[PDB]
Amino acid sequence: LPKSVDWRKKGYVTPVKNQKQCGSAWAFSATGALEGQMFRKTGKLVSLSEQNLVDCSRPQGNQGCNGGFMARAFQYVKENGGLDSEESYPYVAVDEICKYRPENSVAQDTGFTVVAPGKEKALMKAVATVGPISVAMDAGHSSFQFYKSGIYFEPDCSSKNLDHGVLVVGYGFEGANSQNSKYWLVKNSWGPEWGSNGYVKIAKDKNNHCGIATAASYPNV
Ligand SMILES: [Cl-]
Ligand SMILES: [Cl-]
Ligand SMILES: [Cl-]
Ligand SMILES: [Cl-]
Ligand code: NA
């Protein structure tokens, strides 16, 4: 596999978004993975609608602003036949009436692929060969809230009890040796002001730190 990957440098990733006071990170993680796969298929980068997922995917087991899961969002897009653009179905950060319009759909998927749980090497292969990957993580720490630079490593992090969905856009390493001081490049949904332009470097191959490889998946387009 490549020594490093960064799908932002290839046009696969939209500018950083902000979920605000709504527990919809699972929806931003799912739209980020679908934006990359639609870009790989068509060559067009189009921002997708988190609000469409928040308002319409309760039957699949999501709970809008009270939480949800990326696989359930990809299941909804498959059963639904489509997903509207961010432009046509804007984000308001509260649970609202489902206003899905097929004529405004700009994306589709046939289901999703799961990365084997807990396998950082399996996540590395998916990121190198597919594009950005949806992942769950333990983000419940002040050290994450105030992250700004460096490789994030928190002793209090759990690899099994997770509470936040994010998007792995690549991986890399510090220095000249590609085999040490490794990190995952992660896009968050707390706005560009959070973290480093809305991103964080999370320690890689340090025993599945913060659970990044515990529940990873991507849509099949
Ligand atoms: Cl459940
Ligand atoms: Cl999931
Ligand atoms: Cl840094
Ligand atoms: Cl940057
Ligand atoms: Na920084």
Numbering used by the authors: 1 to 221
Paper text:
As a working model, cathepsin V was chosen because of the resolution of diffracting crystals (up to 1.3 Å) and crystal packing with accessible active site cleft. Reactive site mutants C25A and C25S of cathepsin V were used in structural studies.
The pattern II group (binding shifted to the non-primed side) consisted of structures of nine protected peptides and one non-protected peptide that all bound uncleaved into the non-primed sites. Electron density maps of the peptides enabled the unambiguous interpretation of residues from P3–P1. The nitrogen of the amide protection group at the peptide C-terminus was bound approximately 3 Å away from the ND of catalytic H164. The amide likely shared a hydrogen bond with the deprotonated His residue. At P4 and beyond, the features of the electron density maps became weaker and less precise; however, it was possible to model the peptides KPKKKTK, RLSAKP, GNYKEAKK, and EVCKKKK up to P8 in the averaged kick Fo-Fc omit maps. MPD molecules were bound to the primed sites of all structures.
